[PDB]
């Protein structure tokens, strides 16, 4: 229905705003764009489902997220990709891991404070009905 379309449009606007707040934080610059296969030719070979915040925006705009739970699975991938690709004790790896954990924690904290649980429940039930 059009009311359901209105619900998903409000979801899209909410997710666009959370993603923009993450993308303008200087800590998260490395997560804003895909990894350049020049700088890092092994990336695409190690990480099978690359994800970054620009890809998340394109997904929102393609109507790929019908719930905040699905959006958070992609935020979780940005985090787990960096834990897998940068697992060493050296400070460059530790700094990327801490930034990727902080991204994830920040997205979950904004959602805890600003997502109404009944709005998420509605999205989940429309999705499950499709
Ligand atoms: Cl830096």
Curated annotation (Swiss-Prot):
Q: Which family does it belong to?
A: Belongs to the AAA ATPase family.
Which domain of life does the UniProt lineage start with?
A: Eukaryota
Please state where this protein is localized.
Answer: Nucleus
Residue ranges the record marks as coiled coil: 108-130
Kindly state the tissue distribution recorded for this protein.
Highly expressed in estrogen receptor positive breast tumors and in osteosarcoma tumors.
Q: What is this protein's function per UniProt?
A: May be a transcriptional coactivator of the nuclear receptor ESR1 required to induce the expression of a subset of estradiol target genes, such as CCND1, MYC and E2F1. May play a role in the recruitment or occupancy of CREBBP at some ESR1 target gene promoters. May be required for histone hyperacetylation. Involved in the estrogen-induced cell proliferation and cell cycle progression of breast cancer cells.
Ranges of residues in domain Bromo:
3-114
Subunit text: Interacts with ESR1 and NCOA3 and these interactions are enhanced by estradiol. Interacts with acetylated lysine residues on histone H1.4, H2A, H2B and H3 (in vitro).
- Tell me the stretch of the parent sequence this chain holds: 981 to 1108 of 1390
Expression induction per the record is: Up-regulated in breast, uterus, colon, ovary, and stomach tumors. Induced in breast cancer cells overexpressing NCOA3 or treated with estrogen. Down-regulated in 5-fluorouracil-resistant derivatives of the colon cancer cell line HCT 116.
| Natural source organism | Homo sapiens
Q: What is this protein called?
A: ATPase family AAA domain-containing protein 2
